[PDB]
Amino acid sequence: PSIKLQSSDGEIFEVDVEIAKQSVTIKTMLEDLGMDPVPLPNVNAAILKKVIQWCTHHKDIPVWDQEFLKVDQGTLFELILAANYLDIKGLLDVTCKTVANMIKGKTPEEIRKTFNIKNDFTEEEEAQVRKEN
Amino acid sequence: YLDSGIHSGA
Amino acid sequence: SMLQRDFITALPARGLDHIAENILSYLDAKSLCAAELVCKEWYRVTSDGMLWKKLIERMVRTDSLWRGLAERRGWGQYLFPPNSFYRALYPKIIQDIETIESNWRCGRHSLQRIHCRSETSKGVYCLQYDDQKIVSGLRDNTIKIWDKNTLECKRILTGHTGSVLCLQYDERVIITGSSDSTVRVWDVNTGEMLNTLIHHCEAVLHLRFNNGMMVTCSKDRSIAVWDMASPTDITLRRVLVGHRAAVNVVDFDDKYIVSASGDRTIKVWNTSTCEFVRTLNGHKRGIACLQYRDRLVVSGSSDNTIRLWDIECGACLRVLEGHEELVRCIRFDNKRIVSGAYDGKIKVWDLVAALDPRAPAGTLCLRTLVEHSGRVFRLQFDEFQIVSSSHDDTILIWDFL
Ligand SMILES: O=C(O)c1cccc(NC(=O)c2c(Oc3ccccc3)cc(C(F)(F)F)[nH]c2=O)c1
């Protein structure tokens, strides 16, 4: 069977029932509230197409996902949010692990540069945090 | 022979 | 859309603090320290998120060394006290690990010595221990259970009519094999004899059991495979024959049964089907002891060497030389091999080094420990200690913490 997913824009996607249902959230809307189509006010068409692509391929971060996640941080952030909203644990996990890999093995200054973060410690406050390591 | 836990191929 | 985005600030801002915390939970300690100094909000996320507590808990969940320390040192009481307590604790745990690893490498330990006080035939052939007790099998035909903390004898189990050569226990039962050719099943709590298996024609030299099945092996040159529906309902499934001398040891998991023999061979059998798979050949004399887990078999032989083997291809990965007499017991964990010999000496080997073919042989034996006055028959160890037993009628606890 096919189920229509409706993005926040309004664009409708025909999706197979068993892949769609990788999101417990979308599964709940089908099985418990019996809604067709499934409105998704928190996911736009561009992000929704990206998530559907990821779900099909996945019917502990492999090589195909790493290429899929070669996107800007703004899109990765939107992807984290969609995975949370849809509750797709697999996608939330790989995206969060991807962010942690961008953090690990760097000095605080290099981390700041990665994410465009300004250092807002007082001199005194930074020394105290540093003294405790 | 004093070790009863193991045995050769005899 | 946006080129860059402060995930750790942005996520809590939208009420998704747990996602930000989950991202940081993947950091190693040093990267978690770095995250603390990125900016005030990053620090708040790690602190309000109790990230240092979560980091210690993940280790206890993922590292028996950390789990063991939590228990021994008592800081485990606080797991599952502010964030700063765990941040300050973490380096103390690291230093603790470092001192333990140094004690192993340098042989610094304390020693407890149990005199088993055997009236006639002296010696302890086998043993297993936990945090509460040491269960031991003796040449005087008894099983003695010792309190791990006070070292007193809490129970003597009688019923075998020859030496207790091998034993294993779990949360419900002790199972023993004997020179009298029987296997016996005892209640681990009360010591009551629950079952006796009459089958082997000669001394039962080794046994292992797990998850409802047991393998036994005998001086009679056979292996028996058992299904245990309960302590009192144990059925023979198959007899494996093929060894040309006594089978001195057997180990198994869900993939394979592994047996070794006076006939100089290790044999590999399919656990599900009991079909012969392959012989690991190579030792020049009989094999006295063995341990098998995952893909690694390590065996000790009358040829005075230890061999490491891959179970799938049968290759010998390393020959360990250094013992001056028969290698009589052997065990191994993630980091070390521990072996005991007929001359009373115990050796500690660097297992990682041994599995790396670049490492030279002379660097492989970390220490030689000399406190027994007779053949070492059995040992068991963990991150913190060794428990060994000997023909000299003693049990030693070697404590590296
Ligand atoms: O023909 C040859 O070249 C040859 C020449 C001399 C000696 C040997 N062999 C052994 O001395 C021996 C064991 O000694 C025993 C120690 C205690 C009790 C009985 C025997 C034990 C095992 C075992 F590990 F399998 F148990 N294996 C062996 O090979 C073989």
Residue numbers in the entry:
A (entry chain B): 2 to 60, 66 to 139
B (entry chain C): 30 to 39
C (entry chain A): 138 to 217, 227 to 547
Which sentences did the original study use to describe this structure?
Therefore, we initially focused on strategies to induce movement in this region of β-catenin to induce a larger, more druggable binding pocket. This strategy was realized early in the design campaign, with analogues such as NRX-2663 (3), where phenoxy substitution at the 4-position of the trifluoromethyl pyridone core induces rearrangement of β-catenin Leu31 to create a larger binding pocket. NRX-2663 displays both improved potency in the binding assay with pSer33/Ser37 β-catenin (EC50 = 80 ± 4 µM) and cooperativity of binding (13-fold). NRX-2663 also markedly enhances the ubiquitylation of the pSer33/Ser37 β-catenin peptide, with ubiquitin chain formation at ligand concentrations of 16 μM and above resembling ubiquitin chain formation on WT pSer33/pSer37 β-catenin peptide.
The phosphorylated Ser33 and Ser37 in β-catenin are part of the phosphodegron sequence (DpSGφXpS) that binds to the F-box-containing E3 ubiquitin ligase protein β-TrCP, leading to β-catenin ubiquitylation by the SCFβ-TrCP cullin-RING ligase and subsequent degradation by the 26S proteasome. While disruption of β-catenin phosphorylation frequently accounts for elevated protein levels, mutations in β-TrCP are rarely observed. These β-catenin phosphodegron mutations including Ser33 and Ser37, impair the ability of β-catenin to effectively bind to β-TrCP leading to its stabilization and thereby facilitating an enhanced oncogenic transcriptional program. In this study, we report the prospective identification and rational structure-guided optimization of potent molecular glue-like small molecules intentionally designed to enhance the PPI between mutant β-catenin and β-TrCP that potentiate cellular degradation of an engineered mutant β-catenin in a cellular system. To characterize the interaction of mutant β-catenin with the ubiquitin ligase β-TrCP, we developed a fluorescence polarization (FP)-based binding assay utilizing β-catenin phosphodegron peptides (residues 17–48) and recombinant β-TrCP/Skp1 complex (referred as β-TrCP subsequently).
